Design a protein around this ligand. Structure first.
Ligand SMILES: *[C@@H]1O[C@H](CO[C@@H]2O[C@@H](C)[C@@H](O)[C@@H](O)[C@@H]2O)[C@@H](O[C@@H]2O[C@H](CO)[C@@H](O)[C@H](O)[C@H]2NC(C)=O)[C@H](O)[C@H]1NC(C)=O
Lengths: 193, 55
């Protein structure tokens, strides 16, 4: 009874970063050696744990947050970081325990002419709390005037697409990111190596 | 008066999307984020220069 990593890492479609998808992993055996030694990931950074010891640990629950961002934003998926993703789309706590895994998807999520299906939040009233998901589409008021539901001078729809094109430079290529949050607060432990 | 800068930078990246230049648009979007965190108005000039290079 292995954990459904295939449903997380080999999903047909990933969520937009503004509306990241959280998959609950429980009541299973997590064969983490499959992911670590796949050599298909560009990023595999663990916090609070080394990747080579994951096979020897049990967790209460594991939550896999999946989304697509651009290459230059991969560094924002980390504790202590800031930026439009870290602040308005997906914030990780300073005491985060888990692993951040990312890989280039220029041959999946990019299309000729540009793939505009993926969105990020550019405008928000304030910074997100750790693991907060804000999917409101209410028009942002940047200026002194009320918007009252109408876009215009200093009133903007909060989301902006990523135009992922196959010819974009590396920092602008799409990356599929999966963050595995490890609940290591003691309990019966439903996820084991 | 600061508000006019935000509107102008915004319009530039929206225009770039319409020209089929997504990378340039993404570069400008970063100027919007930085602008709204700072008093640095030279970001408008950069956005304008990026548009001129694209056109
Ligand atoms: C994610 O999928 C890859 C690729 O899976 C293969 O190709 C698919 C299109 C489909 O036909 C699958 O049934 C195939 O297995 C997995 O990578 C493979 O993993 C196996 C087992 O470790 C290995 O023997 C193969 O050589 C790997 N192939 C490649 C190209 O790397 C990958 O393990 C899957 N990830 C997860 C978490 O399940």
């Amino acid at each position: 009874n292995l954990c459904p990593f295939g449903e997380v890492f080999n999903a047909t479609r990933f969520a937009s970063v503004y509306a990241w998808n959280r998959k609950r992993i429980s009541n299973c055996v997590a064969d983490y050696s499959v992911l670590y030694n796949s050599a298909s990931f560009s990023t595999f950074k663990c916090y609070g744990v080394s990747p080579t010891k994951l096979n020897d640990l049990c967790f209460t629950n594991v939550y896999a947050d999946s989304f697509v961002i651009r290459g230059d934003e991969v560094r924002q998926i980390a504790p202590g970081q800031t930026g439009k993703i870290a602040d308005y789309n997906y914030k990780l706590p300073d005491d985060f325990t888990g692993c951040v895994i990312a890989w280039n998807s220029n041959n999946l999520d990019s299309k000729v002419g540009g793939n505009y299906n993926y969105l990020y939040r550019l405008f928000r009233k304030s910074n997100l709390k750790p693991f907060e998901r804000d999917i409101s589409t209410e028009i942002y008021q940047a200026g002194s005037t009320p918007c009252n539901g109408v876009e215009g001078f200093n009133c903007y729809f909060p989301l902006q697409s990523y135009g992922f094109q196959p010819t974009n430079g590396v920092g602008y290529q799409p990356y599929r990111v999966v963050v595995l949050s490890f609940e290591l607060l003691h309990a019966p432990a439903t996820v084991c190596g | 008066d600061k508000e006019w800068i935000l509107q102008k930078i915004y319009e530039i990246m929206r225009l770039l999307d319409e020209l089929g230049h997504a990378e340039a648009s993404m570069r400008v979007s970063d100027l919007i984020y930085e602008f709204m965190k700072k008093g640095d108005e030279r970001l408008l000039e950069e956005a304008e220069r990026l548009l001129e290079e694209v056109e």
